[PDB]
């Protein structure tokens, strides 16, 4: 979900400081500015670390995983109790680890959000650049460090 370390079978070792941050619980961004706009929205599904779209239906509009021409922003954190997602609008740039489609993503590749909100190699719609190779954490979960800096 968001925190898979609460079912740990043994204590972790905290002596090393290298290769210690590429995890699914690393919510937020690698570098964050105080003047980054953050918007909280209700969500349906599991949009964590994915591109999101607004869905309008009677209730207020909600956000869910999506992309393409419907891309509205990026979900970087979730409160599970309130079922609320923190979103960085697409008008604000972002640097951080995001969910990728497969493991074929390499450095310097241009990326696009797909219909599931996952980043895949490539016109394009947004400017997103991979800074690292895709890294496997679960059998079907790959994270890639990406700088998203607007639309093309």
């Amino acid at each position: 979900m968001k925190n898979p370390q609460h079912d740990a079978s043994l204590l972790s070792n905290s002596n090393e400081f290298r290769d210690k941050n590429v995890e699914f619980f690393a919510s937020g961004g690698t570098r964050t500015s105080k003047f980054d706009k953050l918007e909280n929205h209700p969500f349906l599904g599991y949009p964590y670390k994915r591109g999101v779209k607004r869905v309008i239906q009677h209730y207020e509009p909600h956000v869910e995983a999506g992309g393409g021409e419907d891309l509205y922003g990026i979900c970087i954190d979730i409160d599970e109790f309130s079922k609320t997602a923190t979103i960085v609008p697409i008008t604000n740039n972002f640097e951080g680890y995001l969910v990728a489609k497969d493991s074929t993503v390499k450095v310097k590749d241009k990326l696009i959000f797909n219909k599931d909100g996952a980043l895949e190699k490539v016109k394009a719609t947004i400017n997103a650049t991979a800074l690292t190779d895709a890294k496997q954490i679960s059998n079907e979960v790959y994270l890639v460090k990406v700088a998203v800096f607007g639309n093309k």
Binding site: K37, N40, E60, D77, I78, D79, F81, S82, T84, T86
Partner: protein, 53 residues
């Protein structure tokens, strides 16, 4: 707008507006005049039953 849920980090919050209205009220000054007896001359009109003419 609807109230904003405060959870984790958020910068964008719903707002409350304000408005006003103005009412004008007019006032008018009015006056009357009346005749009476001079103070020093009442004793020449003071009767046992009354004072006056």
């Amino acid at each position: 707008a609807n109230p904003t849920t405060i959870a984790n980090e958020v910068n964008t919050i719903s707002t409350i507006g304000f408005s006003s209205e103005v009412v004008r009220l007019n006032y008018l000054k009015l006056q009357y005049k009346f005749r009476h007896l001079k103070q020093t001359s009442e004793k020449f009109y003071t009767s046992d039953s009354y004072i006056g003419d």
